[PDB]
A paper describes a structure:
Multi-subunit SMC complexes control chromosome superstructure and promote chromosome disjunction, conceivably by actively translocating along DNA double helices. SMC subunits comprise an ABC ATPase “head” and a “hinge” dimerization domain connected by a 49 nm coiled-coil “arm. The heads undergo ATP-dependent engagement and disengagement to drive SMC action on the chromosome. Here, we elucidate the architecture of prokaryotic Smc dimers by high-throughput cysteine cross-linking and crystallography.
A structure of a Smc middle segment, designated as BsSmcCC2, comprising residues 246–379 and 793–929 connected via a short linker, was solved by crystallography at a resolution of 3.2 Å. The BsSmcCC2 monomer comprises two ∼120 residues long α helices (designated as αN1 and αC1), whose arrangement presents the knob-into-hole organization of a canonical coiled coil. The asymmetric unit is formed by two dimers of BsSmcCC2. In each dimer, the two molecules are aligned side by side along a pseudo-symmetry axis, which is reminiscent of the hinge-proximal Smc rod structure (Soh et al., 2015). In the middle of BsSmcCC2, residues of αN1 located in heptad positions “b,” “e,” and “f” are involved in the contact between the two coiled coils via charged and hydrophobic side chains. At the top of the structure, residues of αC1 form a similar dimer interface. To establish whether the organization of the BsSmcCC2 dimer in the crystal is compatible with the cysteine cross-linking pattern described above, we mapped the cross-linking efficiency onto the BsSmcCC2 structure and plotted it against the corresponding Cα-Cα distances (respectively). The excellent agreement between the crystal structure and the in vivo cross-linking pattern implies that both datasets faithfully represent the architecture of Smc-ScpAB complexes in vivo.
Residue numbers in the entry: 250 to 365, 808 to 924
Write the structure that this text describes.
Amino acid sequence: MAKEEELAESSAISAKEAKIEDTRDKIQALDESVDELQQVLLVTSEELEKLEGRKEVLKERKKNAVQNQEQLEEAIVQFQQKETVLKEELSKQEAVFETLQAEVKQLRAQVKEKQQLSNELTELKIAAAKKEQACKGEEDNLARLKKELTETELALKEAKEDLSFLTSEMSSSTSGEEKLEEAAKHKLNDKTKTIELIALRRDQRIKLQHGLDTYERELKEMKRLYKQKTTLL
């Protein structure tokens, strides 16, 4: 009977040796659970800096577009500036044509008016073509002066060219900004939260791995005192 409950004490060794084999299977459930999470974190991390890179593309396209937008606004201002001058000048030079042919009609008449000697009236005939020719070209020069306004006013419709260009830097970016900045900030929270699971689960297992440190040593004596007493009797 004395030994009958010597071994009935060794039954607890089976409990501890079972609590071990039950506990080591509690840790590895998490050393691959974590492993599954580290393969998720890998994926989540890839999407962010792919997205964060895609966000950098529009920054290259606009800052290249801004150099194209501010450039055309200069042209838009420069062309309207020339157009205001040419249309003023053409009108100003058109006035010379008006004053031109007003002097020529009086010239032919006045020289003929005195004629109603004659050489002094033909001295106006010389003054006729003198006034006529000096103001014949100005009637034709301002005509071609309008041709520079036939190029500028149309160039102002190459300013509309910027707006058409711009809306492809907007609705391609604005539809892209809601496609990038919405997702890029949203893809991050999944990344950080996955790291927090791992950090906890790793800490959750080290508390059992420290539990295992005690449990695995307690057996070495349980199996020694029993072994040293088994050699006694």
